[PDB]
């Protein structure tokens, strides 16, 4: 959006650091770890004297804010509860970080220093903790207000310092730098997802890609229009697009950070900038949330943004299949049969199963790059939400080594996915009496049969499919909006592939 | 519809009046009233002799038709029951009058004389009873047969005489003249509402206003097109119209019957020629009645027609926001954010809440006339039918004096409205995380939330809002069609303001 | 598809006929019939000996396939069970024929000889049986695979011989010749119905009619476009078409096989190439089956094709009213009022009752031919499926003799219809307060009131109406697709009218 | 629940008062008020020095918590923002009070003192501000946890002191005493509403009434079982109950606090302890919220509990009509006709319109008390939520003075209602061809026709009807549960009647 937050790692003593706010952890009910103890001592016991009064039980995320304490160079000391466990899990760690950030946002302090190195998080060393902490803090600063007449008061907080021991400082620094690049990527993804569909159409996304190439000389962009798509034979891509006044776009991103002889990784993103269902029209209730139907393509933008900042030694291709799905006098009809670019014919039984019809033509297009892996990302099926809910993405693929790599990256990022099977027995649900493939398989196993459909275009390479219909946005409440998932998972996968 | 039926007030004796039909009231179980007693005596008791056979019980609206009676100059005598009550209520008086017109319409009499001045109506004097009676009779003669190949046989009845004492004659005459103007306006409103949506589109309504100016030289008319609406920055209005092939129109009516120093009264009407719901498409059952979605604009035409006939000493402005809500490949999508003329940003969560989107821009435009009152009329919410039904109109406003003036006028006209609260606690339902206002507030308090939306565009003037979704038309049966409401309330309001 | 199967009638001894497969009937628990006995004796009881081992119970359609048997010139003998009754019904006869064909299809034999003359069929002589047997066999060979990349293996089976006694062969061969012409017409009807709606639009059907005229020089074709339809005043036909990008067509077919002084029979076909419902949009589930909403017109194609092959001495006219029904910003709205060719005005309460709106203008057009009968065929109401299911067509009409003729033809063809009454009491369900006719009559008696609507345009001639909404296609499963009904009923009607 | 928080009014100086937490208001960008300035002065400018740092913007409900300040006897000072307005609205005042309570709840302080006398609340003097403030604080302490295995930690906070000038202290004292009685009644109401329906059945409510009579010697209780209801002839009440295994109860409460010659006020409460809808079964989703269908009766409990605490000089009668609405083999069927106690026959078209069927027999029973007002309270129609939402109760009545008294009471209580009209034109929606009254009037004006039905049993006295379907509970979120409305309105009505 703008960003700006400076994240610094320092190895200095907390009790003499000049800062507007020093942040210390307090266990249930006091316990005081090493850093907090040293600060207490420096004040002559004022902190333990306050805690003894009992206002802070020490549960995860509780807070107690003190002003000037004797002999400290911190204008304020913020105590945050760390619970009673010796180690926190990932969810408690994030909750603790978010409670700290929420307090700091309301203060007029220009910086804060985090003396949180004494916290233990299950399975996480210094680098893995920094990645989680900094990503939560940086992504927590996200603001989208460009159509609000009354904008939010700018934050006074402009700097966050992570205190670490000198032996850990290099690991914390590296984790912080990667986390910032990921958060910057998610901010781009969230902006693209949150924009209204009358602004964020396929032509607009083409221009956004060209702008990203202006910012990053390492990025090459090409944008194909409908004439080029028809030349290439993308009959099912064009079938989705034809009902709309807005022309479709295929956006190609290319980054060559490795040797010319290294096979590229390809990211394929579903970019339906608004999904009405078409002639198979959706119900009205909640259909404004279909502006998030391009979050797949948005996450390819976000991942490129993070990789371009980090300058990873990999070769990366992004393919964004962008169209708007509208009803009209020239829209695709249920029962239409079209010829995909692969040559397979498809009977379009349901015009609201349109994401797989733009992706399948992009998966055929991807063959030309001779890729060592191909991952498509798409807000594809409501069935995935029934299967896995809103906090775990659906994952399928035709190569188990690649599926394993993506699961592992999702566990490290705390951006988790879960595999569903593409057993051959499911494929017959896509049989059509009239064409090579039907575009829907009926009410059983909807997420899997959608993956089975895509698999038929991905046989020439190692391929996986992330269904992010549940994880790409929040539906309601104060926090309705795009999430930026799965940029953390995708970037961590590429970070490992780059070693 | 031409009408052209003559209403006369006379003070002559009923029993020597030459007429095709003389109409007398007969009470239930009490003595003939003064007039009927005199006619009975004139005939030598022939009427009381017939009534003694017991065919006419005297219940409200029952009738007995007699041919020629001794010593009378009426070719026929129509007896109509008046009930047992000393005073009739408004509904009973209307029912009595409709029973009389029904019988007269089936007769070959060219004229009829009504001797009903002995009837008492609760809270109603001579002028008030005449307003109700003449309005009922004139509007009951309304006929719409434009698209019928077999048109109705013309009525022989062409003159109706109201017999009144010389002391009440002036008041009865003033009531008849005002009631006739109201019924003429109602006939224009009913015609415009009953017209098919393929004929009555926004361009047609602009040509009808130009015709009203050719008939009334005191009326000035300006019709603005989409290009001018864009110069004015009316984004909400243009968003509702973009999906249709039919161009939008803002019709401006201006009548100056008072001095240039008198601030104008502004009437703003919803002119949605047809409401399909848009991308948020409505179900098909009953969608034909969405041709009555321009009855608010039609009510402004009708009130102007009544005021132009009565030449009232007032300055009146009419703003008719006209558009057609249609599904298309260029139609507004749920989630679109638009900038209103006021600069306020609006997130259109539901394309079927488009009436408020054409009215908000019209209310902003109304500010230029420095109005002393601004009243919007719209078939806005079906929640108003759940709240107040089809007999009472919803009324909301930012000024208690204007709301009370409109409620008193509705009580005088027997075209009643009812106030619903615009408490500030309802406004939060229109909160959007992406814009200044959401166009919908949820399943609770729909009528109030629509008024709260319009209130954000009416803060610079005294404003009121009439929801006529349930009162502007009858859904089915043999009397399916436009009602002409709320022209009676609006003309009574303007008559009180002209004094 | 291309057909090609040769049907021959021969009167030779079954046991010396050289054939790839000789087909014999075996009764359940009764002795072999005359033909089967003679073949068994020719083998020395080989067939008796096999049947004694009990593998073939002889239930209708059971089979037992033998290779080479002593002293026969058939490479194979196929035994098919014929049940235990002395006569078969039409359903069992068809079952038997289909089981035989299914076995032959899977064999590598180039021909087969059917020694089935012994079978008896309730109420069917030699000609009636041959009509049923050959039509079932020929139509059973239909294949639609033009959008399958992997096409079916061509059959080895190219010739079928019917063995008949010399006394019967003349009737058998006439039944066979008629059955083949009917099957060829069905194949054309089935192809046109099975084509996807993005290919088979009204312009495509027009070109298909021109192609049929190049094939049969006796056929004259004229294709009218939108401009000519507007010249003719076809307002309700045009209202259906106006929402779509695809222009409408009225296709006129004329065949004069009789003297010029003899009045023609007219077939009027509903050619809605896809039915979305329009603004009154259908639900998405199963909407792909609306490509069959032109099977009415397709059956007129197929009837002409069979009549042209047979060169019947009749004068025959076909009118195919073709349009596509889509939602758009210019589509017809519920509540629109239009003027039909006939001058009657119609209120379009429901844009999904569109078939009768193109048919009524075609019925008026048909007056110019001064016909002696007019039959319209249409997939008109889902209510007919509720009434009569998927195996009996609904039949209505204004002439009792014509209705009787069609029922009798249906019984003979085993393609049955059933009459529903058009009692004048139903007509008032189509009363509109605004026009001469409403296009729908509510939820009661939906098939009948659609018939009553059409009857108002057919008063000048003898007319009947076939509602084939249930019989024109099979909805799901392996055999999903067009049926070709009612070509067999219609052709049998013309055959009888030609005598 | 237990309650028992001590509320005291004192007139001492805030700056020398010994307290665990002193609470002061801070304006947004205006000077500290008198109290707050006195305290700042006594600390030598410590509070103003902190505020200059800028952490507390001063918006309504923002907080800043300080520890020991120099020269104060307060262990802690809580600063709470009061906005920038000179006067607060009721909503802002409650929000401010709730933010203070939320902070105190989390502290270990045993008491707190509130120096908020400088706050102006629009339209409210000392007594009216105290009523609102103390009711918000006391009701905000409510806890319901009897089926949770993990109970909430008891609060340390046990005493709240309101600081007031000696000139206002008597009025603040009186408001505080009334507010705590109202809050105690709401706690009983909320407990009864929150109990699960397998515990809180009609018999249980009867025993609860007896327990209330043990606690308050002024209260007399009578509990009638199904035998007694039938002897009284309450066929409509019994019709609702018969489908359930739980027997019904009519509970009569009587309190005689005035001279025996004062006519009583009667409160009639709908106590449907669970509403399945019966044979007219409700949908499954959200049906758990039908345990709140006895909140009408619970509010009569709560109002008595407050009146008995205050010992008001009034005569008060309570009638709780309690039944459970279940489907079974003996349940009332749609179309049953029953004879009410009044003798009017009712045709039960919908067994889910059951509240009015138990209330109507209670309204007839109420005649024996010769009351000067009768008020029924019922979670009656979901249509009320459509008309007025979740924050305003619907109000209807046969006496304009009584209706105005209740509206005024609700405005003072900030527990508002809104009148809907019972025009005679609505009554005909209850016409039945088979009985004196139908129990439903169709989809229009559902709240009004329900009031119309009840009005037919209330003609012998001044009567009003509160529809609390939207205000009696909260549906979801953290705060799902009964609200205790309209106990504040009813108690304020009784307070004014007792002067
Ligand atoms: Mn979709
Ligand atoms: Mn989609
Ligand atoms: Mn609408
Ligand atoms: Mn509308
Ligand atoms: Mn249709
Ligand atoms: Mn159709
Ligand atoms: Mn109920
Ligand atoms: Mn209930
Ligand atoms: N402090
Ligand atoms: N955790
Ligand atoms: N693989
Ligand atoms: N990883
Ligand atoms: N996202
Ligand atoms: N309107
Ligand atoms: N059969
Ligand atoms: N022709
Ligand atoms: N026949
Ligand atoms: N029917
Ligand atoms: N009855
Ligand atoms: Na989707």
Give me some keywords for this one.
part of a larger assembly; 4 chains; 499 residues; alpha/beta; eight-stranded mixed β-sheet; six-stranded mixed β-sheet; 21 strands; 34% helix; binds manganese (II) ion; binds ammonium ion; binds sodium ion
The profile of the biggest β sheet of chain A is: 8 strands, mixed
The fraction of residues assigned to DSSP E strands of chain A is: 15-25%
**Molecular shape of chain A:** elongated
Q: What is the largest interface, and how many residues per chain? A: A-B, 32 and 28 residues
> Oligomerization state of this entry?
part of a larger assembly
Helix content of chain A: 25-40%
The number of distinct β-strands of chain A equals 21
Structural class of chain A: alpha/beta
Distance linking N and C termini of chain A:
30 Å
The Cα radius of gyration of chain A reads 25 Å
Give a list of the ligands.
manganese (II) ion, ammonium ion, sodium ion
DSSP helical segment count of chain A = 14
The neighbouring-strand order within the major sheet of chain A is 9-10-12-11-15-19-16-17
Keywords (chains A, B, C, D): Aminopeptidase, Cytoplasm, Hydrolase, Manganese, Metal-binding, Protease
EC number (chains A, B, C, D): 3.4.11.1, 3.4.11.10
Active site (chains A, B, C, D): 282, 356
Binding site for Mn(2+) 2 (chains A, B, C, D): 270, 275, 293, 354
């Amino acid at each position: 959006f703008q960003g700006g937050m400076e994240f610094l790692v320092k190895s200095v003593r907390p009790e003499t650091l000049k800062t507007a706010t020093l942040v210390l952890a307090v266990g249930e009910g006091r316990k005081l770890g090493a850093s907090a103890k040293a600060v207490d001592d420096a004040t002559g016991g004022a902190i333990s004297a306050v805690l003894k009064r009992g206002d802070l039980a020490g549960k995860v995320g509780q807070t107690l804010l003190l002003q000037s304490l004797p002999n400290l160079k911190a204008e304020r000391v913020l105590l945050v509860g760390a619970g009673k466990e010796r180690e926190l899990g990932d969810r408690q760690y994030r909750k603790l970080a978010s409670a700290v950030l929420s307090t700091l946002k309301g203060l007029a302090g220009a910086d804060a220093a985090l003396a949180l190195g004494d916290l233990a998080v299950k399975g996480r060393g210094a680098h893995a903790k920094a990645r989680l902490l900094v990503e939560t803090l940086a992504d927590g600063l996200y603001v989208f207000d460009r159509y609000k007449s009354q904008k939010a008061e700018p934050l006074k907080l402009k700097k966050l310092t992570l205190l670490a021991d000198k032996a850990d400082s290099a690991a914390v620094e590296q984790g912080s730098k990667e986390a910032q690049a990921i958060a910057n990527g998610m901010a781009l993804t969230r902006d693209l997802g949150n924009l209204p569909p009358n602004v964020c159409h396929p032509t607009f996304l083409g221009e956004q890609a060209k702008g990203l190439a202006k910012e990053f000389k390492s990025l090459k962009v090409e944008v194909l229009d409908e004439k080029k798509l028809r030349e290439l034979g993308m009959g099912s891509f064009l079938a989705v697009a034809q009902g709309s006044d807005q022309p479709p776009r295929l956006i190609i991103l290319q980054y060559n950070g490795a040797k010319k002889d290294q096979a590229p990784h390809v990211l394929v993103g579903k970019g339906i900038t608004f999904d009405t269902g078409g002639i198979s029209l959706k119900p009205g209730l909640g259909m404004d949330e279909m502006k998030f139907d391009m979050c797949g393509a948005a996450s390819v933008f976000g991942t490129f943004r993070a990789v371009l900042e980090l300058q990873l030694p990999i070769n990366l291709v992004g393919l964004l299949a962008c169209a708007e799905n509208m009803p009209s006098g020239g829209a695709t009809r249920p029962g239409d049969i079209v010829t995909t670019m692969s040559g397979q014919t498809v009977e379009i039984l349901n015009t609201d199963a349109e994401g797989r019809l733009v992706l399948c033509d992009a998966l055929t297009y991807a063959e030309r790059f001779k890729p060592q892996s191909v991952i498509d990302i798409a807000t594809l099926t409501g069935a995935c939400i029934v299967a896995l809910g809103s906090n775990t993405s659906g994952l399928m693929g035709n190569n188990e080594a690649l599926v394993r790599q993506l699961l592992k990256a999702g566990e490290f990022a705390d951006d988790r996915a879960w595999q569903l099977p593409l057993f051959d027995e499911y494929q017959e649900q896509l049989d059509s009496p009239f064409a090579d493939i039907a575009n829907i398989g009926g009410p059983k196993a909807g997420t899997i049969t959608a993956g089975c459909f895509l698999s038929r275009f991905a046989k020439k390479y190692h391929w996986a499919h992330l269904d992010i219909a549940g994880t790409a946005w929040i539906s309601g409440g104060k926090d309705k909006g795009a999430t930026g998932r799965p940029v953390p998972l995708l970037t961590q996968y590429l970070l490992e592939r780059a070693k």
